[PDB]
Amino acid sequence: RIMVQFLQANQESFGIMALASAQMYSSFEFTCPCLPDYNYAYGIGILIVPPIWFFLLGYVMNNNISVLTEEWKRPVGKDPAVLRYMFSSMTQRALIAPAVWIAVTLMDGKSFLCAFSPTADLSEFVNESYQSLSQKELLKIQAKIPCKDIFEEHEIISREAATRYIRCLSQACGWTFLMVITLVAFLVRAIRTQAAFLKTKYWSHYIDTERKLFDETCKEHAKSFAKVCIQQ
Amino acid sequence: RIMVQFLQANQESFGIMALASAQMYSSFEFTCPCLPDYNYAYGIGILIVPPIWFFLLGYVMNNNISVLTEEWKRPVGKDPAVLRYMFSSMTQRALIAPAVWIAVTLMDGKSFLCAFSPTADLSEFVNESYQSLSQKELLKIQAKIPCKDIFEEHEIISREAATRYIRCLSQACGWTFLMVITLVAFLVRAIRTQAAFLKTKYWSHYIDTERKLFDETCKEHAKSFAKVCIQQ
Amino acid sequence: RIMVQFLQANQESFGIMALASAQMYSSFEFTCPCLPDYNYAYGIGILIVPPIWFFLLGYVMNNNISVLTEEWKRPVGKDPAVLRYMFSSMTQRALIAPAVWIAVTLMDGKSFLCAFSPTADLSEFVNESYQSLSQKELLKIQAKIPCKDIFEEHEIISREAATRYIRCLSQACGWTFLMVITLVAFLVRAIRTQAAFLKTKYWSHYIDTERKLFDETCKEHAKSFAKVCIQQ
Amino acid sequence: RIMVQFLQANQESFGIMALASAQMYSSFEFTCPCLPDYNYAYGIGILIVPPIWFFLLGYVMNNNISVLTEEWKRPVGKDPAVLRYMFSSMTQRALIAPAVWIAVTLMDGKSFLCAFSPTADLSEFVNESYQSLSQKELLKIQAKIPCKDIFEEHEIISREAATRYIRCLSQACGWTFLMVITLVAFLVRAIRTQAAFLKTKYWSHYIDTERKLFDETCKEHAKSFAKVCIQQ
Amino acid sequence: RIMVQFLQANQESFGIMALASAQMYSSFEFTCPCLPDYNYAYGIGILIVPPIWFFLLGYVMNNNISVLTEEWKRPVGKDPAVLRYMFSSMTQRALIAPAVWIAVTLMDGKSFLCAFSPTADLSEFVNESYQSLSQKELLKIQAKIPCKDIFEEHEIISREAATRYIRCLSQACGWTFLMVITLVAFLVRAIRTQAAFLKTKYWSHYIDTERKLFDETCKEHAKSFAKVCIQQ
Amino acid sequence: RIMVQFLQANQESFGIMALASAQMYSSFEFTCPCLPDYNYAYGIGILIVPPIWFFLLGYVMNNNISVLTEEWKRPVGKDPAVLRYMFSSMTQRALIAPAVWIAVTLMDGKSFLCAFSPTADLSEFVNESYQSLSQKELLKIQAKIPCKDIFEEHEIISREAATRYIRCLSQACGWTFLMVITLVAFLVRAIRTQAAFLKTKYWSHYIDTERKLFDETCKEHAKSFAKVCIQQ
Amino acid sequence: RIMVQFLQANQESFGIMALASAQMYSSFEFTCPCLPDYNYAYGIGILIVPPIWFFLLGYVMNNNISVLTEEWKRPVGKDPAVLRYMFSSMTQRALIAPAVWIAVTLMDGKSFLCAFSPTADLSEFVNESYQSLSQKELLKIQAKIPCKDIFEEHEIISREAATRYIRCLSQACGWTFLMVITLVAFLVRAIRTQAAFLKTKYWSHYIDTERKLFDETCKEHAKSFAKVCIQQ
Amino acid sequence: RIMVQFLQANQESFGIMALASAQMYSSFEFTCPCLPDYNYAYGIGILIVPPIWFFLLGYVMNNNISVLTEEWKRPVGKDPAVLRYMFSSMTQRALIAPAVWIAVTLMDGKSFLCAFSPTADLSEFVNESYQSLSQKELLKIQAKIPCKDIFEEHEIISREAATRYIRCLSQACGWTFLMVITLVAFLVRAIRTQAAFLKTKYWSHYIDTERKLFDETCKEHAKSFAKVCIQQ
Numbered sequence A, B, C, D, E, F, G, H: 001r002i003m004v005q006f007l008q009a010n011q012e013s014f015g016i017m018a019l020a021s022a023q024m025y026s027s028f029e030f031t032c033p034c035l036p037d038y039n040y041a042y043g044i045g046i047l048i049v050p051p052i053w054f055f056l057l058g059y060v061m062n063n064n065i066s067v068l069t070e071e072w073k074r075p076v077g078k079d080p081a082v083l084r085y086m087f088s089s090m091t092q093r094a095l096i097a098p099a100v101w102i103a104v105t106l107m108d109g110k111s112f113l114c115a116f117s118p119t120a121d122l123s124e125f126v127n128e129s130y131q132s133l134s135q136k137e138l139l140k141i142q143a144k145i146p147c148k149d150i151f152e153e154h155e156i157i158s159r160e161a162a163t164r165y166i167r168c169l170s171q172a173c174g175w176t177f178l179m180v181i182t183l184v185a186f187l188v189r190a191i192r193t194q195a196a197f198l199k200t201k202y203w204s205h206y207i208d209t210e211r212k213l214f215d216e217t218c219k220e221h222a223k224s225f226a227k228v229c230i231q232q
């Protein structure tokens, strides 16, 4: 409920793909398979592949990827640097949604709990009676931890006690990730290109004005033949 | 509830047929027949035929299919190319809603669960007591899995344990589909036609201006006889 | 609740009679009589007569049925064609609400369940104990199926198991109907009349301009006598 | 709850007296007396007298009933025809709310259930044990049917089974009424008066312009004496 | 809850005192004293005195009662007729809220139930065992009827059975009152004064224009001395 | 809940201090001390001192009390009459909120119940067993009546039966108060001063115009030195 | 819930710091320590230090404290009086929020209950059995009174009976405080400085005009060099 | 719920990073690990590192950090003081969100409770029976205090009694922090730079005007070649 609450708060306070990723996470039915073989795969996949898809999507939604591939494809493109600058700007704009997804899914330690439960060392939580049993038997039990309606072995492991531990580890990792990302962003904004920016601004203005003028002249050239044919 | 939540979030953030398909799924009463003979048929049908209907509908709602069939029907149409371009644009605009429907119904593994439950290999979930019994007897039991109010054989198969497994497989398939679709869209937007676009823009502007001029001249030609007849 | 949800979604997204029929269905208290003699009649009636009433209503709400009957009544009407075109347009606009009603009431298999329950062949659901009894005794029991608060014979037939079966059949029929209707609409929009359209547009513009001019000249002719009489 | 839902839907979609009657029904506490002597009277009264009051009210709210009675009262009124046309238009506008009330109260078979329960033939619902008893004893029991908190004789008659039967009959009668009304409206709009309409339009415009001119000239004639007296 | 629902519906659809009286009733804590001596007094008082207060209030809120008493007080007032017309108009505008209050409190048979319960003849509801006991003992019991939390003698009288009876009588009286009021309003609007209306319109326009001119000339006469004193 | 409901209704329908007092009452935690010594004091205090504070507050919020005390303080004030008129107008505007508070707190008989419970004569409610006991013992019991969670002596006095009685008395007193206040307001508006009103209107317009002119001339006199100093 | 209700009512009716303090109180988790040593300290602290912080905050948020300290710091400031007037106005504007906080926290007798419970004389509430025991033992019990989930000694002291008593005392103190504050405000507004007000108004207008002129001239002086450098 | 309530109140009343930090806290799932080794670390981390990240973020979001690092990097920057002033202004604007976070997380004593529970001296709460046991055994029990669903040793320590104590200490620390911060802010606003402010204002206006002029001249220079190329 906290995720939906912050979603509504972000909507009220309200570049846009961030809210898209947040909403998609808050409305995605995370279901851990709760099996010793697919737990790790499912957790790491939910952690890894959605940001990759968001990266690709952010590249696709960009309106000027066509000019980029056109210039990269030609031997001598009609300058040499606005291309690198435009590509860097596109990549930087696209990298936002994956980072938001990773941060959200780490602060909410569901993927971490699903992925690292079967193999983690939970020895302070395992009951004192069954403190000597094969780790192969512990594998299934620990894998069933992230499932409330499946874990029916409270006599061996306290579920909430290990859930809180793993979730705290996940939140620590999330805050570390956020700090590193913010430091990198600070360095980037403090270091980084002057002529390329002006050239790109000019080319964008030129494209817009050309499109508008083309629409206008098409309308004017159509009005004449319209008056000609209608009078028939 | 997550589907309706993301529906409301999409409505708040808000080409339109995507929201139409999402809403239609979130408000469609999926009822698995829970029978070994019609489970597969019903699941695959819900997966397959609604996107076909959405494709046809998107073709019908298009305002310029009439000109397409008129030109395809004539021996020598009044150019050759803008037709192929217009048809490709129509098809690309129409293909959006089916993809959204398939993605949604795969992320929510209801159709997958209904379709693949009776024949899947659920051997780690079947109880150890009835681990040796005819697969024909297992057919009905496994078919009854997606039905909460019908599956009354908890002593043979854990329902939730297999539900999570099949739903995880469905979500994996959904993410794979999304990745492939995004890659194809990236390639299409990066590869693909210059004169046809301008010709289509000009023809659209001409049609609009002609319609507006016709309305205007009809009003002007009517005003005279109106003043003539009213004075009687 | 799904019907009301999609009603609200359609209202938010928002020719109008479609929403009218959807709302009327979502707010109509469908009560199956649950009797072997009136079940079929009630179900088929709810399926058939409301779309007929919607058809008639859509014909009545049309603002230019009077001109149609005036021209059809005269021996020589003041052209021949715009009449057929206007009538076809009226019929096509009117046929929308009945189709929406039928589609909605088929996707929600209440009418189908009420109509086909007493006579359908439910042999896989009838308990194995009373698997040999007179179909006349089965008539009342099966007729009582669509009534939750009346069906008190769970020892003979599983209610939900047959409800899901009949509802799935109804949804299949609904999707078939939708596909056929969409194909017919595609063919109609792709095949079908050029002069009649322009003539109808001109006549509509003429009628509107004449009405407006009549209002204006009435006001002007009234102002004089108003100034005359007020000064008394 | 369905009536209030459709009330809100009609409000959202939104001549006005229709919504007034619908709201008044949805907010009127229908209380069947549940007595063999007053059941019929109360049901038929709720069915009959509210539409009569709505008819009278619609006549009263009409702004030009005074001119109608003034002309009907004079020996030679200052034309002959616009009176009949104005009266017919008033009656047609007024007849809307009673029809809406009757349709609503028939689709919701409360009045029908209250009125026809004590005397209807409910022989398939009366228990097999007391299948031979004086109809005078059955009178009170059947009269108590529409009262949930009063009918405490479930061992003699199944309440819901007869409630559904009578409600289905009421809904059939309601749909029949709607069909007949729609057919009559279609015939009226298709048959029916040309000069009277123009005369009424002109007289209405004249009245409006005269009122506006009178207000203006009153203000102008007052301004002079205002400037005269204020300066004192 | 029905009263508040219709209150909200009236607010949504939305001379104003009608809504005021409706709201005041829907938010007034009607508490029957449930005593054989004060029941009648309290019921009749709630029925009678609030409309009297509403009448007085509607007279007070009227902006031109001062001119009425000024002219009625003078021996020779500065015409004779517009006074009677203005007074009749004031009374007619004021009489709306009391009628609405009476209609509402009669349709909701609380006052009727509180007032007429102790003395009404409820012989078909009194149990057959205590069918022979002093009416003085029946007085207290019947008086306690409108109180749910006080009436603890279900073995002598069925509370709901008599509540429905008295409430039905109250609703009948309410509909009769509404019909009579509507008939009287129809007769009044059909019968009833020509010069007085114009004179009142002119006097109102004159008063308004004089007030506006006085404000304007006060501002103009103040501006001069303002410019004079500010410069000091 | 009725008080908050009417608060919301008044807010929707919406001199302002009336709503302020209503809101303050609906959001004030009335806690009867339920002791034989402080009950009367607390009830009468809640009845008396909040209207006094509202009176004082309404006097303070008035924007022209300073001119009143300035003129009352001087031996010869710069006319004699507009002072009495302004003071009367201020007092009349201020007297609204106390009356609203008293009316509200009387219609909701909480203060009356808290104040008059310990000493009232409740002899028809005291049980027949303890009908002969010292009034000093009855004092505490009756004082505990307005407290639901404290009154634990149901065997001696029926709590609700006396609560309804006292609340009915309170509502009677409230309606009497409202009637008397409305009669007094009618007499005041019908009796009551002509030159003083015009003088006050003129002085108010003069004050407003002087303030506006002073602001304007301050801005103009500042602009010059602004242009002078900025250029440095 | 009453505090939040009045918060919403104040928001709907809606110098601003008053609502800030009200909201901060309604959303502050008051937790009495329920210990004989820290109860008094915590209660008095919640009563005393938040208004001090609000006073300081209101001083800080004031936009012209800098000019005040600048003039107070100089030996001969560039007049003598507007400083005292500006300081008095600042203090009066700042004193609003602390008074609102104190009034709110006194009307809601939580701080009073927490502070005065351990040492108050509650002898009419202590049970008759333990009416002779060391006050040191009574200290802990009485201190635990404001805690619902901690006070588990109902056999010695009735919790609600003393809670109501102390809360009534707190409300009395709150009303006394409000009356005294209103009287002081009345005296202040009736007594209190003519030239200082005009001087402050003029200085404020001058500051505003100077700021606006400076922005304008900065823009104009920048435009020239902008046109100069851009053309390079 | 109080935090979300004040969040909504702040949103309604509504430099922006304050609301961001408040929302992020109200929607952050604080999960104390409830272990004697990681409790302190987790609590202090939640207290310390989020404000550091907010500080860095506020530095990054600042639009003119690039000019700061450009001037700090050059040997002789194109003045010497607007840099120090701009840096101080940036730091002061950035320091807001960390302070809000610390204040919020201290008023809501969750971090304090998680951090200081295992080592605090809770001797008045430990039961009298186990008042002599190794502090190593008390370590785990006290560490489990902030966990409602884990602390299952009510026979040794009263959970709520110590929770209230530690939360009161946390609130005291929070109010102390707020007072110190407000005093420092008062001193800063009262002490602190005249030429630097004007220079920064001028440079900002110059930058804005230059950007706008550059956009304009780019559009004008593009229009010519647009008209040139379109005509081809």
Ligand SMILES: *[C@@H]1O[C@H](CO)[C@@H](O)[C@H](O)[C@H]1NC(C)=O
Residues within 6 Å of the ligand: A127, A128, A129, A130, A154, A155, A156, A157, A158
């Ligand atoms: C540990 O196991 C014993 C029996 O083996 C059981 O009684 C006890 O409740 C268990 N405790 C926990 C914490 O699992």
Ligand SMILES: *[C@@H]1O[C@H](CO)[C@@H](O)[C@H](O)[C@H]1NC(C)=O
Residues within 6 Å of the ligand: B127, B128, B129, B130, B154, B155, B156, B157, B158
């Ligand atoms: C397996 O079956 C046995 C009896 O056959 C039953 O006692 C046990 O609960 C079952 N377990 C599961 C997981 O189905």
Ligand SMILES: *[C@@H]1O[C@H](CO)[C@@H](O)[C@H](O)[C@H]1NC(C)=O
Residues within 6 Å of the ligand: C127, C128, C129, C130, C154, C155, C156, C157, C158
């Ligand atoms: C079938 O009938 C038997 C007795 O005739 C009963 O025990 C059993 O529960 C019934 N089963 C079903 C599925 O109706």
Ligand SMILES: *[C@@H]1O[C@H](CO)[C@@H](O)[C@H](O)[C@H]1NC(C)=O
Residues within 6 Å of the ligand: D127, D128, D129, D130, D154, D155, D156, D157, D158
């Ligand atoms: C019919 O009456 C018998 C006894 O007379 C009773 O046992 C049975 O439940 C009743 N059945 C119905 C349907 O009323």
Ligand SMILES: *[C@@H]1O[C@H](CO)[C@@H](O)[C@H](O)[C@H]1NC(C)=O
Residues within 6 Å of the ligand: E127, E128, E129, E130, E154, E155, E156, E157, E158
């Ligand atoms: C009538 O009274 C008898 C005993 O006097 C009791 O058993 C019965 O339930 C009562 N019935 C009603 C309807 O009050």
Ligand SMILES: *[C@@H]1O[C@H](CO)[C@@H](O)[C@H](O)[C@H]1NC(C)=O
Residues within 6 Å of the ligand: F127, F128, F129, F130, F154, F155, F156, F157, F158
């Ligand atoms: C009156 O008191 C008797 C015993 O003294 C008790 O049984 C009875 O219930 C009481 N009745 C009321 C109405 O208090």
Ligand SMILES: *[C@@H]1O[C@H](CO)[C@@H](O)[C@H](O)[C@H]1NC(C)=O
Residues within 6 Å of the ligand: G127, G128, G129, G130, G154, G155, G156, G157, G158
């Ligand atoms: C007073 O104490 C006695 C026993 O000491 C107990 O029975 C009684 O309920 C108590 N009463 C109150 C009001 O505490």
Ligand SMILES: *[C@@H]1O[C@H](CO)[C@@H](O)[C@H](O)[C@H]1NC(C)=O
Residues within 6 Å of the ligand: H127, H128, H129, H130, H154, H155, H156, H157, H158
């Ligand atoms: C203290 O411990 C005793 C037994 O050791 C137990 O009976 C009692 O309830 C405990 N009390 C508290 C307050 O923990």
